[PDB]
Structure formats: C-alpha cells, structure tokens
Amino acid sequence: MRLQGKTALITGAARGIGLEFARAYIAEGARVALADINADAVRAAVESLGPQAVAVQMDVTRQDSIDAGFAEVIGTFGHLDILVNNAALFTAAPVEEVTRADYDRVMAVNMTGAFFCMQAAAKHMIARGKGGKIINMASQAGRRGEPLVAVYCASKAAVISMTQSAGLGLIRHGINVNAIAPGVVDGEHWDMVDEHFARFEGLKPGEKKKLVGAAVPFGRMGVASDLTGMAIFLATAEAEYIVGQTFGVDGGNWLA
Amino acid sequence: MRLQGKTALITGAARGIGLEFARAYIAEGARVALADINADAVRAAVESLGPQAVAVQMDVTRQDSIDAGFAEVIGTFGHLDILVNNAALFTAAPVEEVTRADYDRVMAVNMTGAFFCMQAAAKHMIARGKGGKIINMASQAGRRGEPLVAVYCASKAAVISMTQSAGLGLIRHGINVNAIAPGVVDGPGEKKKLVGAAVPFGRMGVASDLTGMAIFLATAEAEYIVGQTFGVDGGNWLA
Amino acid sequence: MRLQGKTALITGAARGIGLEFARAYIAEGARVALADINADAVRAAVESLGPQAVAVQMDVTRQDSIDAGFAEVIGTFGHLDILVNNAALFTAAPVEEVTRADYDRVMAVNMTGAFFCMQAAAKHMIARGKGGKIINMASQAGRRGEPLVAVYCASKAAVISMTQSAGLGLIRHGINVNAIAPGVVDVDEHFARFEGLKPGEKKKLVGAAVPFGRMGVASDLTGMAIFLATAEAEYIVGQTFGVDGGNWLA
Amino acid sequence: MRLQGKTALITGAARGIGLEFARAYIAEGARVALADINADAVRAAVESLGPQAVAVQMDVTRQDSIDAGFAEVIGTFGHLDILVNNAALFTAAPVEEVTRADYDRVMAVNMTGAFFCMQAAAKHMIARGKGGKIINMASQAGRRGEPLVAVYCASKAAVISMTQSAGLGLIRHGINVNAIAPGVVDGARFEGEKKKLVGAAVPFGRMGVASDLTGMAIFLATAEAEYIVGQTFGVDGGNWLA
C-alpha cells in the first residue's frame, strides 16, 4: 500500500495504459478519478474498479472542460496528490501529406491538453502547499523523429520538454514532475498505430507486428503492466529527489 | 562564392538572424526571397542588397499566406533550392501563469509555422526532383526545459523533432533537412549580463556567429548530413 | 520486503553510498556480499550490517581478484542475482594539467573495473540461466563534460555506454543492465582551489544551485537501487536514470 | 583556400579518413604533418601529397612518442594551429567474451591516445597564445551502445565526453575543441550481403566515404566556426540523430 490515502487523476483512463494505472493505484490504496471524453466508457471503467474510483467526463482540448473536471475532482476528493497525463491520439503521414486537421487534433490532445492539465494540477498543488506528483506519458517517439510520424513525435518531444520546464519550476513547491516513455505497447495501443500505417506500406497482414516485436531487444512488445511499477514509484517518497526526468520503459527499444 | 545559381526563401527576414542570413546568402551569389509579416520592414533590406533580393509578405501562422508566398517565390525564381525557417516569437512565464494567448501565438509561429513552411518547400522540391535544403532554427531551449520558458522550450523541442522526422523522410528525394541551435543571442537587467558572462566563449551570441553554419548546411559539402541539429552557442550547451 | 531470498554483490561497499545500498538491500530481505579493496574496512562494515552481510576483499583493478571474489560469493550463496557496480574514484584537473598517474588510477576503477565486474556477473548469470540484475553507478558527470573533471566525466560517460551495450547484449539471457546517475552527493580542497574557493564555499554554491534545494544524500538513491533490482523493472533495459534533484535532465 | 598558412597534425593519417583529410587540408593551403605508428606508410603518403606534407612517426599509446612527435612538428612548422585526432582501432565481441588484450589496445588508441595528443596540442596552443583548433574523431557508436561493440562504443563515448570537457576548458585560450561522428564508412564470426544491408539501411542510401567528412573537417578549423565549442557533429547520412 505504497499510495495509501493519496488521490490521483488519470486522463484517458477508460481503456489501455490509463485503465491499468487506475487499477494499480487503487490496489496501492489510492482514490482515483478516471477522466475521458466519453462519459459512458469512464462510467463502465469505474464500475470495473469499484468504489475507490470516480468517473469524470473531460475534453482535455478545451480549457472550460479542464477547469470543470478539476473542480469536480477537488470537490469530490478535497485535494489532488497525483496527476497522470495519459490522454493521447496517434496519426501517421509523410510530412508532405500532413493535413492541418490531423496536426491540430493530435497537438491539441498530446501537447496542449497535457500542458493545461499539468497547469490545472500545478495551480491546485501550489495553493494547497503540501506538494504533489505530476507524471506525463511521453514515448520513444518523443526521443527521436521518424519518417511518417512527424506530428506524433513532435507532440511527445514537447511533452518531454514541458516535463523538464515544469519540473524545475515546480520542485520548490514540493511538486515532482517526471515522465514515462513507453516503447511499442501490444494489443489495443499497437492496433491504433497499425491502423494509421495502412495507406503507406501495410506489409502483409500482421507480419509487421511480429517483426517490430522481434526487433525489441527484450523480445516482445510491451504490456501495460510493464509500466505500472514505474507509475507507482514516481508517485512515492522514494522518488522525491527525481525531478524533470523521462524514464524509458521500452524493453531496450531506445536508450536514454 | 558558395551558393551561385541557388535560390533561397528566409522567413522572419526583416531583422536579426534572418536579415544576416539574407545578406550572407546574397554575398554567396544566391537569389533570396526575404519573407516577413510586414513587407515594408523588408523593402529597406531588399533596396540595399539589390536585385538578387525580393520582398515577400508572408505570415507563417496562416496556411493561405504560406501558399501565396511559396507560389510567388516559385513564380519569380522558377524554383526554390533552400528554405530557412527563421520566423520565431519568444514568451516567458512560470507554467502556473501561462495564458492560452501566449501559448497559442508562440506555438503558431515557432512550431506550426516552421512545420507547414517545411511542408510547402518539400512538396515543391519533391516535384522538381533536383533535391534541396531546409534549415530550421532550433535553440539550446529545445534541448532541455528551463523554469520560466516552458512554451518557447517546447516549441523548439518540436522543431528539433520535426527536423529529424522530415530529415529521414525527405533524404530519398535529395532534400537535406537540418537545424541550427543558437545559444543566448543579443536580442533587473542582472540576468541577461549574468547569463552573457557565463557563456564559455566569453560573450552572448550575435547573428554572424551562425552564418558560417547557415552557408555550410546549404552546400554540397553537407550532402551526407541528415536530420541533425548543430549547437552554435559558444559552449553554452553540449550536444 | 522487495528482495526476499535475493543475493547481491556491491563493490566499494565499506563506506558511503555502497554501504547505504548494502544496508537498504538487507532491510528488503537480501543477503549482501560487501566487496572492497580494504580487508579491515570491509570486515568492520559487515560487523556493522550484521549476519545477512558477508565480507569479500576485492581489488576491482585486477582480473585475478575479480575472478576470485565472484567465484567465492557464488560458492557462499550458491548464486548471485544482483551486482551493484559502485566502486569509484574522483579526480579533478584542467585538461592541460592531467597526469598519467591520475588518468590511469580513475580509469582503472571507474571504467575498467566496472566493465570486468559486469562481465564476471554476466558470465555467472548466463551460466545459471535464471537471468539477473546489474546496476552501474554512473553520474551527471557522464552526461556532459565540464572544464575541471575531464577524466572523471569521460570514465562515467564510458559507464553509461557499457550499460547500454551490455543492456542490449544481455537482455536475451533475462539480465537487466541499468544505471543510476546521481547528481552531487554529500580531493574536495584540490577541486575547490581551481576556482580559488575553499571546499566549504564550493559545497554551499553547488547545494544552492540544485533545483530541489540541497545536495543529495545516499537515501535519495536507495529507492531506485531497490526498484531496478525487482520484477517491476523487468522491461527496463540499458537505461541510465538521473536521481539528481533536477541538477541534470534526461 | 580556407586554411592558407595554417599548420595541421593528423594522427593515423597513412590511409582512409586521415589521408583524405591531409589531401583536403593541403588543397586548402595548409601545411600538414601526417603522423602514424608506421613511419614508412606515412613517408609514402607524404611522397604522393607533395612538400606541403611532412611525415612523423608517432605511437599515440606512448607518452614519450607523443612528446617526440609534437616536438618534431613544432620544430619543423614553428607552431601548430590544428590537431585532428583520427587514430582509431576497432574490435567486436559480446561483453561476456571481451578479452583484456582487446580492451586495453582499443582503449589505449581511441581514448587514451586521443586524450594525451589533445593535451599535447592544448599545452603548445596555450603557450603560443594565438588560439587553435582540435578536431576529435568520434562515431555514431559513441552516441549509444550496441550488443557486439561494447569496447569500441565506450571508447568513442569517452572521446565525445573529453571533446566537451576540453572544449569548455580551452575556449578561454581561443582553442576550439569539437568532434565529427561518422556513421558507417566504406571504409564476421558471430553471423557480399551484410555490408550493403547496413549500407542500404542508411537513410541517405549508401555507406559513407571519406569525402562526406572533409567539408566538416575544413569548416571546424576556420573562423566561420569560432563560436562552435565542445560539439559533436553527426555526418552519418541520417543513421543517427543528435
């Protein structure tokens, strides 16, 4: 029970990595607000986690929806100890084909949404004066550009930068800002990525997946439970001297 | 004379680094379109530098201005060999005070503007099939965050990232995408002179410290350089 | 009790961070071999830590002492699960004043000693076929050079490099190689003198410039040392993690 | 003629990248000392390059041979403006098989030799008081480890670190210290084909040649690079990003 009596807000928590972080945090004795744009999906997730979980509808692309969501969580819990910025969209396209629509929608969620949710947590944690924890979900894609993934890579590079900036600015208020950079994650996350590479190569139905998996030094694609240990550790006092860092949990797919 | 028969478009070319690059490219025998939001602020420079220089009114935050400016440069010169993505805005504020207005306006020039200008240059250079050069202006700020400069740092980390992605995607067409990362550039008061004094070289950066690298990356001696960001910062950062 | 039934070998463990790692590991249920060059210091450290500690005299600058020490620990415990490569020396000199004597003795401990201990751990862990954990002590010094610390910085840059190479090479045997990069943790005089300072004045200036607001203590680092040795870190491969109060960013 | 009147010393210059740097620096008006462990190999290079070139026998692994080699060049030229640290050995083996013999001999040339040659250059350049240029040869291998290349990678990561430390320390004396990081250049046991697999896999479309690097070797030796301090520049066809 490494988070006993702590309160957390996780964005994009209805499914995949965010749902798994909410589960693990409840198992460590935290109260968790699960935020997602889809009220039905986040109601269902809360129903699967039990009475330590609460559902919040939030569109992280809109300031008024951010302020209302935070107001609701603070109203219910009284205070917020931990923000996990996990909401993200994927897109792929050669730079010469990227549309304003895809650009705008991936930047609004991955970068701007993460920034202003971090700001909302930060303002609440400064006012309270008891510190807190902010964990941004970055990506291997944030460490180096790749062809076809310019928009996604740039959004995650900005998440790593804002983790650093906010980390050095907020540590004097006892707020630890850090990031986790997953590698290639299996199942539902992979399928999001795979669906955006259809128009380009699509090399043979499902061979791409075992190749990318085979090429991960560890020998498989990631599962959500590879990340939960790091998500818990960064929210504990054993990590109070860790400030502004991005930790690769990627089976050796990247080195930092 | 290292850019003879080359054509260049430089954004934010009215003053500072952009102007210094335009003068330098003209001296190396390039034709240069100096682009800025205010065409009058560029007619003076276009006047002194003579007929190898042309003025283009372009606001990099608007797609329709990007389209109009690139069609105008390609229409005047017939082709575009070199893009320098130099248009940039600064803001400072602790993360807790950052306004939507500041965030949007700095992101619109530094990240989105750079990105869609690079795209327009690429569509033309791919079609033409003779290769090309795209030089993005990053910064030491895009290498690591700092406490009061979260918006500016993140916009420049995005520039570094898109230089890498575009670099890897475009080299098969013979297009070299690279970036120059200035350190602190000559642009209560105790801080700028504390920072300036702390540059290992011994002074704050001037625009002309960068012109060497700006010429070099646009020449055939740099043809095997792909998706790189080069620190020209007097030792103020290490990469 | 996150390390119950695990066996560790910690180099440079008679004092400082290595001793505090040994102590924290014993509190998590591990048996710990403390290796150090000084037989009295290491017997005194084991008497202080109690009966879950064992003493191994080991000079990490010699292959004969490395081979003997690992063989002895594997014989005593039956197996070795965790190596902490902690033995290190500090030196400072501007590049134009660096001696062969200083260069040789710091490189022999920090780079060569770390490399050949990691290889002794790897050989045993490959043979046993149950995987293992190797944690290298790097530094902020390994991430970027600085004017007075060329030899120490280069040695820790080599530690990061070999963590990455060995990390990628060994993970198919289930061995996780990773590194901890401390910031400034609480020789000194010689170092302060280059800027015309007393070490007292130096430590205060360095302390104040840490974003967290103070120099590090060993207990800032013990959490990460335990974490990287557990199943919760199984997908972490070849990484170096800064525990440095914000003094560096990675 | 970007190096008219300048003097250079290039270590490991008998063949490959060092010889091409020697040729390009001479073509730019420089006097060049070509240093190598093989006196006869570097005497033959000087013969093909002409009298702008001089031959120096130097074993970069021995302090005495470094001091004698720098003494000869300063003797012959009066001063040294530019050092290129180009001497390098390669080795490969998985970490569990690395021998002390391979470790010591690659570290001795790539790391220790480059360090003490850079120190010899710095001491002369500090005494003379007119600044100078030191260009270390790093590698993509120095940016990140890889499984079979632990020794070579660590050697080149140390080269990048010392470039940074030396660069920050020596710029107060008008000495610019920087490095070039080639990718895969032209240039067995553990696995025709394998070479154009790595080659084809370079984003640019081919393995590197010496002439990809000479532009950057010239540029870092000129006043157009005087604000460039402690940097490593990847010239690698996009095979690494930095």
Q: B219 CB near a chain D CB, below 8 Å?
A: yes
Both tokens assigned to A256: 């930092």
Q: Which residues, other chains included, contact B93 with Cβ-Cβ below 8 Å and sequence gap of 6+?
A: B99, B102, B148, B150, B151
Tell whether C145 lies on the interface with B, counting CB pairs under 8 A.
yes
Half-sphere exposure of C47 (CA within 13 A, CB side): 6
CA atoms of B163 and B142, how far apart (whole Å)? 12
Nearest to C228, CA basis, from C158, C181, C169, C173: C181
Number of continuous H segments (helices) and E segments (strands) in chain B = 8, 7
CA-CA distance, A45 to C213, in Å (whole number)?
Answer: 40
Is the Cβ of A168 closer than 8 Å to some Cβ of chain C? yes
Alpha-carbon dihedral angle through residues B153, B156, B162, B165, given to the nearest 10 degrees: -70
Contact assignment for B224 to D214 by CB distance below 8 Å:
no
**3-state class of B15 per DSSP?**
coil
D7: left (phi over 0), alpha (psi -120 to 50) or beta: beta
**Least CB–CB distance from C249: residue in A164, A230, A249:** A164
Collapsing DSSP to helix, strand or coil, D131 comes out as: coil
Distances (CA, A) of C121 to C88, C89, C166, D100: 18, 21, 11, 16
Nearest to D44 by CA among D22, D77, D64, D76: D22
Tokens coding B201: 């070289």
CB of B228 within 8 Å of any CB in chain A? no
Q: How far is B211 from chain D (nearest CA, A)?
A: 8
The chains found to touch A (3+ Cβ pairs under 8 angstroms) are B, C, D
Instruction: Write out chain B residues lying below 8 Å of C147, CB-based.
Output: 200
Residues of A in contact with C227 (CB under 8 A): 229, 233, 238
Residue B41: count other Cβ atoms within 10 Å of its Cβ. Answer: 15
Alpha-carbon gap, residue B144 to A163, rounded angstroms? 10
What gap in Å lies between CA C166 and CA C159, rounded to an integer?
Answer: 10
Q: How many CB atoms lie within 10 A of CB D192?
A: 5
Distances in whole angstroms, Cα of residue C169 to Cα of each of A220, A225, C163, D21, D138: 16, 24, 10, 35, 22
Q: Is B21 on the interface with D (CB under 8 A)?
A: no
Chain gaps in chain B, named by the residue before each (C–N > 2.5 Å): 187
Q: Which of A165, A173, A180, A238 has the most C C-beta neighbours within 10 Å, making it the best mutation to test the interface with C? A: A238
- H-helix segments, D84-185: 100-107, 114-128, 150-170
Burial of residue C90 (CB within 10 Å: 0-12, 13-18, 19+) is middle
Cis peptide before B169 (omega within 30 of 0): no
- What does the CA dihedral A205, A210, A216, A217 come to, rounded to 10 degrees? -150
> What backbone torsions phi and psi does residue C28 show, to the nearest 5 degrees?
-95, 10
CA closest to B214 among chain D residues: D224
Q: Counting runs of H as helices and runs of E as strands, what totals does chain D give?
A: 8, 7
- B107 in helix, strand or coil? helix
CB contact under 8 A, D147 and C165: yes
Nearest to C235 among A222, A232, A243 (CB): A222
Give me the DSSP letters along B119-132.
HHHHHHHHHH-S-E
**Do the Cβ atoms of A155 and A106 come closer than 8 Å?**
yes
Q: Is D186 on the interface with B (CB under 8 A)?
A: no
Tokens standing for residue A28: 């460590």
| Two tokens, residue A141 | 């894609």
Which residues are A115's β-sheet partners? none
Assign C69 to helix, strand or coil: helix
Tell me the technique behind this structure: X-ray
Query: Considering only alpha carbons, which residue of chain A is nearest residue D146?
Result: A255
Which SS3 state, helix, strand or coil, does residue C7 take? strand
> Residue B237: closest CA among chain C residues belongs to which residue?
C144
> Which residues share a beta bridge with D175?
D132
In terms of CA atoms, which chain A residue is nearest residue B125? A96
Q: Which residues of C touch D230 (CB under 8 A)?
A: 145
Q: How far apart are CA D142 and CA D147, in angstroms?
A: 13
CA distance B86 to B232: 15
Q: Are B212 and D203 in contact (CB < 8 Å)?
A: no
Q: Burial letters for C38-74: b for 16+ Cβ neighbours within 10 Å, e otherwise?
A: eeebbeebbeebeeebbbbbbbbbbeebbeebbebbb
Supply the residues of A annotated as catalytic.
152
In chain B, helix, strand, coil percent, each to 5?
50, 15, 35
| A187-218 CB burial, b ≥16 within 10 A, e <16 | eebbeebbebeeeeeeeeeeebbeebbeebbb
Reference D190, options D124, D104, D97, D123; nearest CA is D97
Token look-up 């930095």 returns D242
| Paired residues of B84 in beta bridges | B10, B135
Chains in touch with D (≥3 Cβ pairs < 8 A): A, B, C
Instruction: Tell me if D19 sits within 8 A of D47, measured CB to CB.
Output: no
- Cβ A149 vs Cβ A92: under 8 Å: yes
Environment class of C163 (CB within 10 Å of its CB; exposed 0-12, middle 13-18, buried 19+): buried
Resolution of this model in Å is 2.1
- Amino acid identity, residue B26? I
Residue D117 one-letter amino acid = C
**Chain A partners of B149 at a C-beta cutoff of 8 Å?**
165
CA distance D132 to D7: 10
Sheet containing D7-10: order of strands: D53-57, D31-36, D7-10, D82-85, D132-137, D175-182, D232-235
Strand, helix or coil at A98? coil
Strand-pair category, A82-85 with C31-36: unpaired
Cross-chain Cβ contact D162/C146 below 8 Å: no
| Secondary-structure breakdown of chain C: helix, strand, coil percentages, each rounded to the nearest 5 | 50, 15, 35
Amino acid type, B34: L
- 3-state secondary structure at position D146: coil
Classify residue C231 by its DSSP letter. G
Calpha distance B61→B94 (Å, rounded): 24
Q: How close does chain B come to A133, measured CA to CA in Å? A: 15
Report how far residue A19's alpha carbon sits from residue A57's, in angstroms, rounded to the nearest whole number.
15
Q: Which amino acid makes up residue D60?
A: V
Q: Which two tokens stand for residue A19?
A: 């749902």
Contact A169 B150 (CB under 8 A): yes
d(CA D56, CA A68): 75
